[PDB]
Design an enzyme around this catalytic site. Structure first.
Site, mmCIF file in Angstrom:
data_model
loop_
_atom_site.group_PDB
_atom_site.id
_atom_site.type_symbol
_atom_site.label_atom_id
_atom_site.label_comp_id
_atom_site.label_asym_id
_atom_site.label_seq_id
_atom_site.Cartn_x
_atom_site.Cartn_y
_atom_site.Cartn_z
ATOM 1 N N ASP A 57 56.489 83.957 79.806
ATOM 2 C CA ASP A 57 57.165 82.888 79.086
ATOM 3 C C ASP A 57 58.479 83.586 78.758
ATOM 4 O OD1 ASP A 57 58.194 80.933 77.052
ATOM 5 O OD2 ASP A 57 57.335 82.327 75.572
ATOM 6 N N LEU A 58 59.612 83.082 78.463
ATOM 7 C CA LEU A 58 60.763 84.107 77.883
ATOM 8 C C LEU A 58 60.834 84.374 76.383
ATOM 9 C CD1 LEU A 58 63.534 83.041 77.483
ATOM 10 C CD2 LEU A 58 64.286 84.375 79.410
ATOM 11 N N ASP A 59 61.020 83.308 75.604
ATOM 12 C CA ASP A 59 61.113 83.424 74.154
ATOM 13 C C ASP A 59 59.807 83.879 73.510
ATOM 14 O OD1 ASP A 59 62.557 82.879 71.513
ATOM 15 O OD2 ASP A 59 60.800 81.573 71.323
ATOM 16 N N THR B 261 65.253 83.945 71.709
ATOM 17 C CA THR B 261 66.291 82.930 71.850
ATOM 18 C C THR B 261 66.183 82.045 70.609
ATOM 19 O OG1 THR B 261 64.854 81.307 72.969
ATOM 20 C CG2 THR B 261 66.113 82.847 74.373
ATOM 21 N N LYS C 28 60.438 73.251 65.839
ATOM 22 C CA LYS C 28 59.807 73.958 66.949
ATOM 23 C C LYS C 28 58.872 73.066 67.752
ATOM 24 C CE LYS C 28 59.985 78.678 65.153
ATOM 25 N NZ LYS C 28 59.167 79.895 64.906
ATOM 26 N N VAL D 284 59.686 70.671 69.393
ATOM 27 C CA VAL D 284 60.197 69.308 69.264
ATOM 28 C C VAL D 284 61.367 69.123 70.234
ATOM 29 C CG1 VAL D 284 61.103 67.595 67.673
ATOM 30 C CG2 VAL D 284 59.562 69.362 66.837
ATOM 31 N N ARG E 131 65.190 67.976 71.548
ATOM 32 C CA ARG E 131 66.520 68.143 70.977
ATOM 33 C C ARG E 131 66.953 66.853 70.298
ATOM 34 N NH1 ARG E 131 70.238 70.676 75.270
ATOM 35 N NH2 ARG E 131 71.351 68.676 75.459
ATOM 36 N N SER F 182 64.796 66.597 67.102
ATOM 37 C CA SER F 182 65.266 67.605 66.145
ATOM 38 C C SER F 182 66.542 67.160 65.449
ATOM 39 C CB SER F 182 65.521 68.943 66.839
ATOM 40 O OG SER F 182 64.311 69.572 67.202
ATOM 41 N N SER G 293 59.086 79.771 82.087
ATOM 42 C CA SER G 293 59.730 79.380 80.845
ATOM 43 C C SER G 293 60.421 78.017 80.884
ATOM 44 C CB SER G 293 60.737 80.466 80.467
ATOM 45 O OG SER G 293 61.529 80.096 79.350
ATOM 46 N N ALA G 294 60.436 77.332 79.742
ATOM 47 C CA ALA G 294 61.083 76.028 79.638
ATOM 48 C C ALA G 294 62.598 76.188 79.509
ATOM 49 C CB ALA G 294 60.545 75.277 78.441
ATOM 50 N N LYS H 260 55.046 72.535 78.290
ATOM 51 C CA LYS H 260 54.120 73.589 77.919
ATOM 52 C C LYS H 260 52.653 73.309 77.713
ATOM 53 C CE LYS H 260 55.761 76.987 78.181
ATOM 54 N NZ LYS H 260 55.874 78.308 78.885
ATOM 55 N N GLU I 295 52.056 84.969 76.615
ATOM 56 C CA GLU I 295 52.628 83.953 75.732
ATOM 57 C C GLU I 295 52.660 84.299 74.248
ATOM 58 O OE1 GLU I 295 54.029 81.095 75.133
ATOM 59 O OE2 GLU I 295 54.349 80.130 77.068
ATOM 60 N N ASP I 296 53.552 83.627 73.531
ATOM 61 C CA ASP I 296 53.688 83.822 72.094
ATOM 62 C C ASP I 296 53.391 82.522 71.323
ATOM 63 O OD1 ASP I 296 56.193 82.506 73.006
ATOM 64 O OD2 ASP I 296 56.968 83.001 71.013
HETATM 65 MG MG LIG Z 1 57.594 81.586 73.760
#
Ligand SMILES: [Mg+2]
Length: 221
Positions: A8-10, A16, A45, A47, A49, A52, A114-115, A145, A169-170
Site C-alpha cells: 500500500d503506500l501511505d 502522505t 479519512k 472519505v 474529496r 471531505s 495504492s489508491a 480499498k 497494510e496500515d
Molecule cells: Mg495506507
C-alpha cells in the site's frame, strides 16, 4: 514460498497523510473556515474529496455554487501536489529500503497496490521506482480499498495470483482488501484498528524478508 509482496503506500512505504491534512487546512484557512484541526481531520479519512470538502463546509454552514465547489476541490489537490514536491529518499519508512533490496535479490516480485494518484511520482522522488515490477493504476480499479480489486490487479500485474502473495497494510479496509483477494496480510499498527485475526508489526522496521518468510511458513495450515 510466496512469490510477490503487494505494497500500500501511505502508512507503509511513507507518509502522505500529513500532506493531505495540511492541504485541507490551507484550503479551509484560505476561505476563513476554522476548526480543521488534527482531530477533525480524523473524520476525513477513508472519505471522498467531495465528501471531505462538504464536511468542512458544514463546519461554517458555508454555501457555495457547484462551480465554486469543484474549484475548491481542485485547490485542495493543487496544494497537495505542491506540498509533495519535496518528498525525498529520507522520507522512506524504516526497513522498507532494505526489504525492497532483499526481495529483489531474492527474485520476489514487488508491486504497488495504492489508491494514490501520485504513486509513480512519489516512488520516483524517493528513488524506489527500479525496485517495483508493477504499479496498479488506481484509475483502473473499479472498487476502492475495502474491495480486493486493487490487490488483485497488483498481483496479476507481476504475473502471480494473489494467493501467492503477501500484502502489507496500515488500514483496516486495506487488511480486509488483502484477505478477500486471497493474499496473506501483515499489518503495521495495532490490533485495535486492524483486527485480531492477522499478524501485525508495531512499526515497519519489522517488515524484514526473514520476518515475512517466517510468517508465511506459520501460515501453512
Ligand atoms: Mg495506507
Amino acid at each position: 514460498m510466496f512469490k510477490a509482496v503487494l505494497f500500500d503506500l501511505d502508512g507503509v512505504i511513507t507518509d502522505t497523510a500529513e500532506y493531505h491534512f495540511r492541504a485541507w487546512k490551507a484550503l479551509a484557512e484560505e476561505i476563513g473556515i476554522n476548526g480543521v484541526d488534527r482531530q477533525f481531520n480524523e473524520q476525513l479519512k477513508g472519505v471522498s474529496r467531495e465528501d471531505s470538502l462538504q464536511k468542512i463546509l458544514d463546519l461554517a454552514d458555508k454555501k457555495v455554487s457547484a462551480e465554486e465547489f469543484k474549484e475548491l476541490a481542485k485547490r485542495k489537490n493543487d496544494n497537495y501536489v505542491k506540498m509533495i514536491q519535496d518528498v525525498s529518499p529520507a522520507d522512506v519508512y524504516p526497513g522498507i529500503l532494505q526489504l525492497l533490496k532483499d526481495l529483489r535479490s531474492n527474485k520476489i516480485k514487488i508491486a504497488l497496490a495504492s489508491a494514490s494518484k501520485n504513486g509513480p511520482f512519489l516512488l520516483e522522488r524517493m528513488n524506489l521506482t527500479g525496485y517495483f515490477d508493477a504499479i496498479a493504476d488506481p484509475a483502473e480499479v473499479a472498487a476502492s480499498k475495502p474491495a480486493p480489486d486493487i490487490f488483485i490487479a497488483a498481483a496479476h500485474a507481476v504475473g502471480v495470483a494473489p494467493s501467492e502473495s503477501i500484502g502489507l497494510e496500515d488500514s483496516q479496509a486495506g487488511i480486509q482488501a488483502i484477505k478477500d483477494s486471497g493474499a496473506l496480510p501483515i499489518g503495521v499498527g495495532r490490533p485495535e484498528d486492524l483486527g485480531d485475526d492477522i499478524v501485525i508489526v508495531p512499526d515497519t522496521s519489522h517488515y524484514t524478508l526473514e520476518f515475512l518468510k517466517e510468517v508465511w511458513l506459520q501460515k501453512q495450515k
